[PDB]
Amino acid sequence: XXXXXXXXXXXXXXXXXXXXXXXXXXXXXXXXXXXXXXXXXXXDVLEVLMRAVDNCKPLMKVIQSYQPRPLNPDQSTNFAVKWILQAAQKRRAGAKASMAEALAVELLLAAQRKGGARARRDEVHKLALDNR
RNA sequence: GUGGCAACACUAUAAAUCAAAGCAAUUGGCAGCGAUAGAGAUGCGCGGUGGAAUAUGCUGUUUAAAUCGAAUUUACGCGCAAAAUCUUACCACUUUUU
């Protein structure tokens, strides 16, 4: 049950991301959770985040040469939240609204098995299956 | 000189020079020869540079002097942890003592 706190805390620490208060990113990510509630019931939040991250687990990693490597699932979480967040900055700098909305809409879409995180994610899944 | 169908196969010395040409175990430098260990050593991340302006140092140009050294790594926020005169050694001018 504590893995909820683990994934959320890794989300926080990766949301820190430039030198600053993790209070600033922490209120930012909690604002993303509440904005996820607002957009989700607009047109049921830890639920959709846990589903989104468990949708996003890269189980076997690959190393270039191309060689697959087995992966301890905590780094699967850790890559996972990483790919989510660089896709988030892609979408938000393209929108240049806040980041909280962007991480919210991305956690919804990666819950819905859609978005560039899911694209990158399952291509490296299949490419791990390719080069055995 | 002997053999042959021959390519040439022999047998066979020297003239002339040199002061070493060599040999074996090493001890070190190589590896475009492997096994074991160690370094963000990478491919793993973050933030820079190089884009703009300012600061700052250096070359080069000129000026009377832009005092003098530092020069590829390890020089270039270096001697200077500080130049408005003085620091200051360089120049223009006016004097001074050997």
**How many helices (H) and strands (E) are present in chain A, helices listed first?**
6, 2
Backbone angles phi, psi at A2, to 5 degrees: -75, -10
In angstroms, the CA A26 to CA A47 distance is 19
User: Beta carbon of A86 within 7 Å of strand B?
Assistant: yes
Enter the resolution in angstroms. 4.2
User: How was this model experimentally determined?
Assistant: cryo-EM
Enter the DSSP assignment of A61. E
Through-space separation of residue A112 CA and nucleotide B90 C1' in angstroms: 79
Q: How far is the CA of A90 from the C1' of B96 (A)?
A: 80
DSSP helix/strand/coil, A67: strand
Q: Which two tokens stand for residue A25?
A: 């990113």
Angle at A18 between CA A102 and CA A107, to 5 degrees: 25
Amino acid (one-letter) located at A54: D
Is the CB of residue A20 inside 7 Å of nucleic acid strand B?
no
Burial of A70 (0-12, 13-18, 19+ CB in 10 A): exposed
Nucleic acid strand B: bases within 7 A of protein CB: 43, 46-47
Name the closest nucleotide to A17, judged by C1' and CA: B46
Task: Report the alpha-carbon distance of residue A77 to residue A1 in Å, rounded.
Answer: 15
Q: What is d(CA A100, CA A34) in angstroms, rounded to the nearest whole number?
A: 9
Residue A63, CB, less than 7 Å from strand B? Answer: yes
Buried b (16+ CB within 10 A) or exposed e, A41-57: eeeebeebbeebbebbe
What letter does residue A69 receive in the DSSP assignment?
A: E
- Any atom of strand B under 7 A from CB of A65? no
